mmCIF file of C-alpha atoms and ligand atoms in Angstrom:
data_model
loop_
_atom_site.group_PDB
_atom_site.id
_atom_site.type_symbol
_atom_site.label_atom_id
_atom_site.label_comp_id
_atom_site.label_asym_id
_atom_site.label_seq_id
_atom_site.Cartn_x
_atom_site.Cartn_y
_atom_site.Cartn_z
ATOM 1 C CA UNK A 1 0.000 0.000 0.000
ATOM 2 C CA UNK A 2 3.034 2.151 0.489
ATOM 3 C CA UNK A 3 5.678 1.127 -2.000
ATOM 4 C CA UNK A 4 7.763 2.558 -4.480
ATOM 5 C CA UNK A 5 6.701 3.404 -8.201
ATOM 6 C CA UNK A 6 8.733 1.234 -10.418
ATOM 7 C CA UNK A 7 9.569 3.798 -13.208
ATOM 8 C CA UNK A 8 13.185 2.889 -14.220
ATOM 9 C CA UNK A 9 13.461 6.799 -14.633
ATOM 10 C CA UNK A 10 17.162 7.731 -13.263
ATOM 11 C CA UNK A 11 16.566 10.566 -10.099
ATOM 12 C CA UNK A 12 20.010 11.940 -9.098
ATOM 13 C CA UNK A 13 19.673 12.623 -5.411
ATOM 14 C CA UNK A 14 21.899 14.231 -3.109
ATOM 15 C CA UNK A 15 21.264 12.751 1.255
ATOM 16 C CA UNK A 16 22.610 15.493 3.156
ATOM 17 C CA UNK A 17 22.607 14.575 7.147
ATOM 18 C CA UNK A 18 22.063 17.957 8.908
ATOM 19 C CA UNK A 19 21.882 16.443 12.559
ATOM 20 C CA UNK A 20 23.691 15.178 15.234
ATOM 21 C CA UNK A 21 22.548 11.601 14.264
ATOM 22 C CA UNK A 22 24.446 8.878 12.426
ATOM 23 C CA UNK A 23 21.020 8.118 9.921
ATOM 24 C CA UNK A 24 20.043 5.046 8.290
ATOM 25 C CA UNK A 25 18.693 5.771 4.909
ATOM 26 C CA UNK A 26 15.432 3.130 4.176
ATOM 27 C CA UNK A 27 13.875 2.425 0.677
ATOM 28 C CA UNK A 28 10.624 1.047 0.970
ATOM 29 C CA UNK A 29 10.815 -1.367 -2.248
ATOM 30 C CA UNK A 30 8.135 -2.285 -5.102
ATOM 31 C CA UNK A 31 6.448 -4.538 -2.152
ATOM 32 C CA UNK A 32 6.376 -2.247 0.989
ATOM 33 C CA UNK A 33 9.357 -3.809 2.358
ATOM 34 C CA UNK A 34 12.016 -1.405 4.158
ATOM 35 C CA UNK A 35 15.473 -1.584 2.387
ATOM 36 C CA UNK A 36 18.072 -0.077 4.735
ATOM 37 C CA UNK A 37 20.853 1.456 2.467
ATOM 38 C CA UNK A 38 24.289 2.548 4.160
ATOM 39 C CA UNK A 39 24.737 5.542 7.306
ATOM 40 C CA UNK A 40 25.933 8.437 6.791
ATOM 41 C CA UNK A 41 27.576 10.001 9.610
ATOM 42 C CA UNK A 42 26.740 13.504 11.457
ATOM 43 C CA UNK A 43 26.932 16.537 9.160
ATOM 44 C CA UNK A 44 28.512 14.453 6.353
ATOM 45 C CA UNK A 45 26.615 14.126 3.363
ATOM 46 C CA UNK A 46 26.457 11.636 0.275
ATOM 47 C CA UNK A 47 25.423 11.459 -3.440
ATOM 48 C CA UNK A 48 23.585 8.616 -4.399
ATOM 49 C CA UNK A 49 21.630 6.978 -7.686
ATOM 50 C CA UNK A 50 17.364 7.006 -7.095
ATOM 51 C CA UNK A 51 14.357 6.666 -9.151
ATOM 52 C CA UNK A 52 11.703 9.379 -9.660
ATOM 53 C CA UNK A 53 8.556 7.643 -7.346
ATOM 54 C CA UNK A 54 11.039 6.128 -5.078
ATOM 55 C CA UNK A 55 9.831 5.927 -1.313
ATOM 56 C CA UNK A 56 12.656 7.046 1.344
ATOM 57 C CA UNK A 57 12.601 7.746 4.977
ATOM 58 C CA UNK A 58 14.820 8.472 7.478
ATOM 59 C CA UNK A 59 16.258 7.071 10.763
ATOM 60 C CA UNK A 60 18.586 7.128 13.784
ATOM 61 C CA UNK A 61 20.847 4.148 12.513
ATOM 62 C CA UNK A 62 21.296 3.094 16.588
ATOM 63 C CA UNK A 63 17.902 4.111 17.451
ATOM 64 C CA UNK A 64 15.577 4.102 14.777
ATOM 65 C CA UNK A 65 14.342 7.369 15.855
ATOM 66 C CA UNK A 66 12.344 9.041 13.413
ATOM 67 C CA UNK A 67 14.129 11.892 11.266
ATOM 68 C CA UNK A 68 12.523 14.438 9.380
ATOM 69 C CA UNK A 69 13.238 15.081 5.318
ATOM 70 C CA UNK A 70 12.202 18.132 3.458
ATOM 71 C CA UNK A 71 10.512 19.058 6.987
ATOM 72 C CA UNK A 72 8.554 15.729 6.079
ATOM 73 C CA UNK A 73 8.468 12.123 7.151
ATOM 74 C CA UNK A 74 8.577 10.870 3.234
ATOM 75 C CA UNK A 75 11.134 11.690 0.713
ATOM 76 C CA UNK A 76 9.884 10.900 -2.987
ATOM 77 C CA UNK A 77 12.542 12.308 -5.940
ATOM 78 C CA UNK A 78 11.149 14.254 -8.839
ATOM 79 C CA UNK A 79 12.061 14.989 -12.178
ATOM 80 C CA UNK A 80 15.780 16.604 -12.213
ATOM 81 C CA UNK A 81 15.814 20.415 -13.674
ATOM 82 C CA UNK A 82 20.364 16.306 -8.433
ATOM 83 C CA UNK A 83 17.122 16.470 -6.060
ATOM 84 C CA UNK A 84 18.282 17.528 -2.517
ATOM 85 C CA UNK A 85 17.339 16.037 0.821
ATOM 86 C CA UNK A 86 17.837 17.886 3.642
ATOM 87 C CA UNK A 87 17.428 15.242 6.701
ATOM 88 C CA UNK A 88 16.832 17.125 9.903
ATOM 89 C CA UNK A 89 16.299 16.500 13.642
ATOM 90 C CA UNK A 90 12.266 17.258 14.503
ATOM 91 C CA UNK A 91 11.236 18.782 17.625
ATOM 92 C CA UNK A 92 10.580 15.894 19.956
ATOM 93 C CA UNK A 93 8.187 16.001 22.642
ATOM 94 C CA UNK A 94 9.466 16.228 26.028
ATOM 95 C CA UNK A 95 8.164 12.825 26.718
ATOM 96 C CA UNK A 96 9.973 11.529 23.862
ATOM 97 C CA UNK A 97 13.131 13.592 23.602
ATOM 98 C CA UNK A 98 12.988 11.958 27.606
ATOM 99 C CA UNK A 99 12.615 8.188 26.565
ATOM 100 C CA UNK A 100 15.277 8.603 23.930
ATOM 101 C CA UNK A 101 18.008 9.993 26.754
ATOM 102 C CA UNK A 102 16.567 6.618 29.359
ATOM 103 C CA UNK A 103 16.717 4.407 26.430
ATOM 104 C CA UNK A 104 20.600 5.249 26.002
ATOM 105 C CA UNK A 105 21.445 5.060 29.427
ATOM 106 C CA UNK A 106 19.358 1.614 30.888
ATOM 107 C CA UNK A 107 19.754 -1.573 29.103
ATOM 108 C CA UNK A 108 16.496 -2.709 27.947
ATOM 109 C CA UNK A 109 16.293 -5.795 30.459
ATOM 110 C CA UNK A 110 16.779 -2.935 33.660
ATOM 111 C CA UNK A 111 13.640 -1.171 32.410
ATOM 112 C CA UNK A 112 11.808 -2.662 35.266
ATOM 113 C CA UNK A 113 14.264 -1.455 37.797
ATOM 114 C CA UNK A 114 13.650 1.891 37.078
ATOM 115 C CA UNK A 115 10.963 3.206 39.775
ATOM 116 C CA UNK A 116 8.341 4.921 37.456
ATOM 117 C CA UNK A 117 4.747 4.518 36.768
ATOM 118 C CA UNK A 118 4.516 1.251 35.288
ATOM 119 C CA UNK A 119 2.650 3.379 32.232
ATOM 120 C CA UNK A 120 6.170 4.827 31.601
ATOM 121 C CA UNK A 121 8.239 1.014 31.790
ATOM 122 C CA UNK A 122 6.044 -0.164 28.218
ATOM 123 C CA UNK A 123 6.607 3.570 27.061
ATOM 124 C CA UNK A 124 10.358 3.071 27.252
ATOM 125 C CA UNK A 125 10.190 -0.844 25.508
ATOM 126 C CA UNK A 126 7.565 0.851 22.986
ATOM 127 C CA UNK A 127 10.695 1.437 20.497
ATOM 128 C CA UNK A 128 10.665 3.196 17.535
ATOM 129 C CA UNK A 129 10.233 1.279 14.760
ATOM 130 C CA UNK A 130 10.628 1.305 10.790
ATOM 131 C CA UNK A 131 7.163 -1.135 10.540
ATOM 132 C CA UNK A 132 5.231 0.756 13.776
ATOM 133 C CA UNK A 133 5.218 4.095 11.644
ATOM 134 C CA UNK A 134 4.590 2.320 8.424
ATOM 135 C CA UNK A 135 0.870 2.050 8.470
ATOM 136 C CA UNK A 136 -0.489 5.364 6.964
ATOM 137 C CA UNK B 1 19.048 38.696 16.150
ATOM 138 C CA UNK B 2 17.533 37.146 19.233
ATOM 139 C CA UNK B 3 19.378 36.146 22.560
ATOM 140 C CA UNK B 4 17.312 34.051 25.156
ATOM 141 C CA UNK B 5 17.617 34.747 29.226
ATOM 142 C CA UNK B 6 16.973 33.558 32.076
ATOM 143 C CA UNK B 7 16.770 37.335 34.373
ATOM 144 C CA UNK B 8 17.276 35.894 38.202
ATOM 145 C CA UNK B 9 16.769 36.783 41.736
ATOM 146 C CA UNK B 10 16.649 34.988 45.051
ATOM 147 C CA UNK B 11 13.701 32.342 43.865
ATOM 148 C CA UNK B 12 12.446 33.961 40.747
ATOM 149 C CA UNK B 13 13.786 33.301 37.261
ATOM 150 C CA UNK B 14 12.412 35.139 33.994
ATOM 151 C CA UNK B 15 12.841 33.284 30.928
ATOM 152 C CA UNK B 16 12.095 35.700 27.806
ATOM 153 C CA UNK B 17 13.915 36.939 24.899
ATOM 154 C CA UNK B 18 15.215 40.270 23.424
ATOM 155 C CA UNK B 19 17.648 41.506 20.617
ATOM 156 C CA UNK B 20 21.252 41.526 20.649
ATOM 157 C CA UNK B 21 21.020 45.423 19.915
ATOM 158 C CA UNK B 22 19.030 45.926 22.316
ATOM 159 C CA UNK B 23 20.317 47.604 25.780
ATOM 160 C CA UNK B 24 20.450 46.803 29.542
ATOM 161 C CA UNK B 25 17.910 49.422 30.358
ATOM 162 C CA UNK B 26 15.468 48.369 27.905
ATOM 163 C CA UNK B 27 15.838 44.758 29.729
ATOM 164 C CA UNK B 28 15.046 46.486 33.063
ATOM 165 C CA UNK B 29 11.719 47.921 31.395
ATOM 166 C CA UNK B 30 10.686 44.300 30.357
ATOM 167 C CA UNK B 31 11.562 43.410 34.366
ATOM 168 C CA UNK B 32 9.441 46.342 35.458
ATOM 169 C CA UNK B 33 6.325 44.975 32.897
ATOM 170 C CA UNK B 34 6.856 41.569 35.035
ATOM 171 C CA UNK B 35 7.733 42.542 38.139
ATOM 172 C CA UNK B 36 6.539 46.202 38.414
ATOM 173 C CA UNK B 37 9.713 47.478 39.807
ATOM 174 C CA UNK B 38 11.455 50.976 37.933
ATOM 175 C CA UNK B 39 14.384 50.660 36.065
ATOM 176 C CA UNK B 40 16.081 52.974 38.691
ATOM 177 C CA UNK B 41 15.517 50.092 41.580
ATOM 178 C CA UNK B 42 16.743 47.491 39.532
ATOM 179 C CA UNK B 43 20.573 46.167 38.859
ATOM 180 C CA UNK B 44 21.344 43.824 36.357
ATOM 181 C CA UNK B 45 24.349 41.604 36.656
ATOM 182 C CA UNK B 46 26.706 39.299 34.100
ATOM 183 C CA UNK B 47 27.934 36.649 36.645
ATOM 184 C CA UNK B 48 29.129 39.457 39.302
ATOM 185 C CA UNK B 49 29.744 41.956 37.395
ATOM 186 C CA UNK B 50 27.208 45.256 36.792
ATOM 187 C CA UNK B 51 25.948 46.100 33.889
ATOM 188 C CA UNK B 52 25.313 49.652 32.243
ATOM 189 C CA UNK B 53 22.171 51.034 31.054
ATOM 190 C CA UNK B 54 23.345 52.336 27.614
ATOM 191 C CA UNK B 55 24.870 48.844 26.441
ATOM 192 C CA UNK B 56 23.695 46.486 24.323
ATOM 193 C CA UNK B 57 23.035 42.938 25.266
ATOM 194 C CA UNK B 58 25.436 42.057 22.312
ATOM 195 C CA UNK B 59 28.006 44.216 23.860
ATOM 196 C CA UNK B 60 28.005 42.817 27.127
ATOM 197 C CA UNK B 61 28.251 39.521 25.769
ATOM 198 C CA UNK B 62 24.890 37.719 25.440
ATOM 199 C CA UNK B 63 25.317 36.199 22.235
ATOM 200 C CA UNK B 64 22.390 34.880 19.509
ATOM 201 C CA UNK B 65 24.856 31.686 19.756
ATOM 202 C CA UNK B 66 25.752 31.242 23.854
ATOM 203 C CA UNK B 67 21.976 32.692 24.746
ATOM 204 C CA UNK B 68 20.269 29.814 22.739
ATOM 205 C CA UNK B 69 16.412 28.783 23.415
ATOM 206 C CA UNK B 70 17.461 25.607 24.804
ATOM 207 C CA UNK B 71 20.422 26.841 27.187
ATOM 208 C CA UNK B 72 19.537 30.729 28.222
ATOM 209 C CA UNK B 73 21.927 33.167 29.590
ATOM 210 C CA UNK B 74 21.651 33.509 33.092
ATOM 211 C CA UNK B 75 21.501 37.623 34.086
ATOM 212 C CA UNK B 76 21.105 38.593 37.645
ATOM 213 C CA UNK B 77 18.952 40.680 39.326
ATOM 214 C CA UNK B 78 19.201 43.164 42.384
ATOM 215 C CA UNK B 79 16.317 45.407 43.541
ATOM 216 C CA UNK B 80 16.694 48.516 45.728
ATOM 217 C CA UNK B 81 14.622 48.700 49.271
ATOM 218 C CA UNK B 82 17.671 53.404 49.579
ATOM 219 C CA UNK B 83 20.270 51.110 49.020
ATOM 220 C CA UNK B 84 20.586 47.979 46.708
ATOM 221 C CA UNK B 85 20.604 44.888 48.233
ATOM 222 C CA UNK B 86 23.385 42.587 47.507
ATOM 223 C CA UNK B 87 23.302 39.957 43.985
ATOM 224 C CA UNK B 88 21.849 36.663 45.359
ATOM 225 C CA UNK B 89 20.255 33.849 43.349
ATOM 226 C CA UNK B 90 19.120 30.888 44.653
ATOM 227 C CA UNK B 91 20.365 27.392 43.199
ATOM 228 C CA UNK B 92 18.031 25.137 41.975
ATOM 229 C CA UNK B 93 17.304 22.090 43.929
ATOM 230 C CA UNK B 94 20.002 19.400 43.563
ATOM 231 C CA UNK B 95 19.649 16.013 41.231
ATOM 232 C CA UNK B 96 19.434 12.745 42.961
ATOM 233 C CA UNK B 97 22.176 10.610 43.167
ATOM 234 C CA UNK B 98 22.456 9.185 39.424
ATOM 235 C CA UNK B 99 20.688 5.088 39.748
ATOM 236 C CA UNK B 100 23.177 2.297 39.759
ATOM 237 C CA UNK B 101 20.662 0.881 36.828
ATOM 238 C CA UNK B 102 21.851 4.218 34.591
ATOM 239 C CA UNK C 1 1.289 38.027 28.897
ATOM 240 C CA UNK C 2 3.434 36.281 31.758
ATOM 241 C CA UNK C 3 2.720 33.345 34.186
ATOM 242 C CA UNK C 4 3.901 32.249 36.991
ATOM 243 C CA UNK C 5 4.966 28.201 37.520
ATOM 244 C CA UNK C 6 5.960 27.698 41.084
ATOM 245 C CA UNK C 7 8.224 24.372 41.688
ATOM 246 C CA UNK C 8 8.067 22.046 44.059
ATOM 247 C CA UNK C 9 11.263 24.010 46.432
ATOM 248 C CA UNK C 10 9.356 27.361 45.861
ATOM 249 C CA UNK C 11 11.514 28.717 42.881
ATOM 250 C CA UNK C 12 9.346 30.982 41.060
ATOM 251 C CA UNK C 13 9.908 30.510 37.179
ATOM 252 C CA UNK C 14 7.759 33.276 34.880
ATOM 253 C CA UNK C 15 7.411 32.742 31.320
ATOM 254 C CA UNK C 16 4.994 33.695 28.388
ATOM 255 C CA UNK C 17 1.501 32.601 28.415
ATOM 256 C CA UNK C 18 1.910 31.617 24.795
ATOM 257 C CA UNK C 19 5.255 29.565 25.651
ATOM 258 C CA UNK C 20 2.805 27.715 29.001
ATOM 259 C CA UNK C 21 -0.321 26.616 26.732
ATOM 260 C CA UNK C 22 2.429 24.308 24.832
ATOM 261 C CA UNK C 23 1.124 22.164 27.696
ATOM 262 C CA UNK C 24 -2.619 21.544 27.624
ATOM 263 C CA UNK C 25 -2.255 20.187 31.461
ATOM 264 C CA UNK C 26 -1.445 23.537 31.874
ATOM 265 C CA UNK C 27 -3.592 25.091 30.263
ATOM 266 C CA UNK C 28 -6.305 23.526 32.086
ATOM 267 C CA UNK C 29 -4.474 24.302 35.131
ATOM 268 C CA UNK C 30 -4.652 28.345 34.936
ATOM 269 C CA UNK C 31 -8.436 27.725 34.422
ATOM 270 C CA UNK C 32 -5.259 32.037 38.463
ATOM 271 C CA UNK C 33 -1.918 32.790 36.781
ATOM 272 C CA UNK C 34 -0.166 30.845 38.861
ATOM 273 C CA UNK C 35 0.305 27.576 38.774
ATOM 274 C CA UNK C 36 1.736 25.187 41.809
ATOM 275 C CA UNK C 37 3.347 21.880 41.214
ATOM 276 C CA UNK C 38 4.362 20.149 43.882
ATOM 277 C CA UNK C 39 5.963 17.240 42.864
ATOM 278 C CA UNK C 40 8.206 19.225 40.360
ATOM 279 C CA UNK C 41 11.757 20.258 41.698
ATOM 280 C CA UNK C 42 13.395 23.398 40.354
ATOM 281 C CA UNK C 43 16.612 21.221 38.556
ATOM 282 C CA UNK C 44 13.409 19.681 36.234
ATOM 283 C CA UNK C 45 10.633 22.699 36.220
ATOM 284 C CA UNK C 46 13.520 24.999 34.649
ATOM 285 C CA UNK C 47 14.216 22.564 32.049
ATOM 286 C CA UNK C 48 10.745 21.911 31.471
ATOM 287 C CA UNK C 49 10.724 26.382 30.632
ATOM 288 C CA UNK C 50 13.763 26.166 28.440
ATOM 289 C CA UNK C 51 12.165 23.292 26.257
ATOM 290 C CA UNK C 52 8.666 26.129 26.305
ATOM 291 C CA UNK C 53 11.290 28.292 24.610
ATOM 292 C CA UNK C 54 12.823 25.505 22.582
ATOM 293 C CA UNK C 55 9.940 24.075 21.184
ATOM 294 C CA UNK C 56 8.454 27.787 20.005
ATOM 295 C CA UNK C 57 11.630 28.514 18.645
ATOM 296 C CA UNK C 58 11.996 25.701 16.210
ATOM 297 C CA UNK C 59 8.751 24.547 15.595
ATOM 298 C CA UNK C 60 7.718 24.782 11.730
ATOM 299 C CA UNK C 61 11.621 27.004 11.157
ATOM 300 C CA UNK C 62 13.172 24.897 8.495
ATOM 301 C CA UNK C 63 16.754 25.734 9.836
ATOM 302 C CA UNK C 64 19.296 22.534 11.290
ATOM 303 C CA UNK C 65 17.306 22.199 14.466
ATOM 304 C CA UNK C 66 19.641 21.470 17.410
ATOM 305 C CA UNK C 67 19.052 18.689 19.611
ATOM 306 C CA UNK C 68 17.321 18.923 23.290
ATOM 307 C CA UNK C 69 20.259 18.332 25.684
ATOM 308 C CA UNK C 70 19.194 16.556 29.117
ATOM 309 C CA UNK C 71 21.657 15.687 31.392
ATOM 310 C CA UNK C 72 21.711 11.856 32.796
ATOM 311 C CA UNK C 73 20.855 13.189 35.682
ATOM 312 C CA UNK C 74 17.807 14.925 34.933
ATOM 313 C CA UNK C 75 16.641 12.132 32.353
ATOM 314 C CA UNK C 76 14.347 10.250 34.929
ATOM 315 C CA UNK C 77 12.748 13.143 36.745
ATOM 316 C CA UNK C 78 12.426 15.311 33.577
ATOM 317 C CA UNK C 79 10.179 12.111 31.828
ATOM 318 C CA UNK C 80 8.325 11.783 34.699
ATOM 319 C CA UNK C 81 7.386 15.428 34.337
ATOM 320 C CA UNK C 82 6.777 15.888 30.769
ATOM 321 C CA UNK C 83 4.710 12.040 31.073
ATOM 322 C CA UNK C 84 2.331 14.045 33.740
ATOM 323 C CA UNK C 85 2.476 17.692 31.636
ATOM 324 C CA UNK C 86 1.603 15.529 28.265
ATOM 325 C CA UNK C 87 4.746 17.416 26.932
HETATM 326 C C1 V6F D 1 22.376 2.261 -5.823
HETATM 327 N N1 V6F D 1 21.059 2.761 -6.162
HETATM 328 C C2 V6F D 1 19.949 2.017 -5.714
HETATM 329 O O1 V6F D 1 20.085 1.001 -5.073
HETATM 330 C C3 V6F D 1 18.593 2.607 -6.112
HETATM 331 C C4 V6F D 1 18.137 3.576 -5.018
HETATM 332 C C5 V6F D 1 16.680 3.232 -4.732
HETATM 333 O O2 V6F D 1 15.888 3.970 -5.642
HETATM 334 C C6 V6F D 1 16.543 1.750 -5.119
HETATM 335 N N2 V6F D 1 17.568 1.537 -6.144
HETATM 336 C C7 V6F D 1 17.642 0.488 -7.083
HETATM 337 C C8 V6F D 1 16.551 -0.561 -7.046
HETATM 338 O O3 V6F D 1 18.563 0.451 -7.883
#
């Protein structure tokens, strides 16, 4: 339901990683599937070889955080007048910028050590996730 | 361009925003707006030391780039009873001890 | 234009009323401009302000948005707070 268009028409794009994050580039193929191509490191950028109808999001390769492209969660390369694709930290809520910082710091299995409201221990397991946010 | 501040005093703290070219005593007439005390009863302070009326924020070092949204400059504040009372800001309360688990 | 959000420790933080309403808990709370939490200590109400400031800042600004620091420290209390705050 959410796949790439298989045009075979060449899309010269450009990933430029303007965060703090090492991201993991992911190309939904013709079926839906999630294709993770290789990271690029913090404030590095790389020139790569797309197709115009091409599905591609963006993630914390450690985390799978979501990333934002083209202030956007989807990044779909037009016709070339190479298409650029400015990837960007979002503004987290509190709540999550929070779980990302816990997450870091408490191995997954010590999630039920931490005293909290047990509401927040299946918050904190609750991951991000490539196939969560793939839905609509 | 836009600095962000935190303007302290004993237990209050103002967090609000003004230009770099802006001056000291148009920071004390925001504080008077919030606090409703005159510009004239009010010292402002860079760590310890005082700051004059005709500089600019930018001047006295609050910088678009150190005075960021997320981490605010800290500038203190002294109010006048006729003499001026001496700088004092209150810490904030201290973080617990960091959990063996972390 | 200001209100007032009183920690736990009685520090006294003021801040915009457009900044506070980020919060709908808050919100709700001032309907009375002040606002008394009593579970929130001043080393996690202050960070709660400078995220107010933060979040107004680089919401919907198309510049490289900077990430949210939070100290190790803070990390636990600071979720607990922002769970409660729905921030
Ligand atoms: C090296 N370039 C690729 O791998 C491109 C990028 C993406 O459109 C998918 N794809 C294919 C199927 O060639």
């Amino acid at each position: 339901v959410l796949r790439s268009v298989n045009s075979r028409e060449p899309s010269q794009v450009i990933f430029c990683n303007r965060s703090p994050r090492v991201v993991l580039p992911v190309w939904l193929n013709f079926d839906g599937e999630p294709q993770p191509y290789p990271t690029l490191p913090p404030g590095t950028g790389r020139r790569i070889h797309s197709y115009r109808g091409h599905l591609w999001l963006f993630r914390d390769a450690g985390t799978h955080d979501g990333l934002l492209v083209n202030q956007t969660e989807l990044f779909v390369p037009s016709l070339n007048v190479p298409i650029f694709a400015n990837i960007t930290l979002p503004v987290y809520t509190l709540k999550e910028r929070c779980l990302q910082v816990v997450r870091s710091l408490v191995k997954p299995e010590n999630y039920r050590r931490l005293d909290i409201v047990r509401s927040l221990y299946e918050d904190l397991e609750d991951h991000p996730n490539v196939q969560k946010d793939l839905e609509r | 361009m836009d600095v962000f501040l935190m303007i302290r005093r004993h237990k209050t703290t103002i967090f609000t925003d003004a230009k770099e070219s802006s001056t000291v005593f148009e920071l004390k007439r925001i504080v008077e707006g919030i606090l409703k005390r005159p510009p004239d009863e009010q010292r402002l302070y860079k760590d310890d030391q005082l700051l004059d009326d005709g500089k600019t924020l930018g001047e006295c070092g609050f910088t678009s780039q150190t005075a960021r949204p997320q981490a605010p400059a800290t500038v203190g504040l002294a109010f006048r009873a006729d003499t001026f009372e001496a700088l004092c800001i209150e810490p904030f309360s201290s973080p617990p001890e960091l959990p063996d688990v972390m | 234009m200001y209100v007032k959000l009183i920690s736990s420790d009685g520090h006294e933080f003021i801040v915009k009323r457009e900044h506070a309403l980020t919060s709908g808990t808050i919100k709700a709370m001032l309907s009375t401009n002040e606002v008394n939490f009593r579970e929130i200590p001043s080393h996690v109400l202050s960070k709660v302000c400078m995220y107010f400031t933060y979040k107004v800042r680089y919401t919907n600004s198309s510049t490289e948005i900077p990430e949210f620091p939070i100290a190790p420290e803070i990390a636990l209390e600071l979720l607990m707070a922002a769970n409660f705050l729905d921030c």
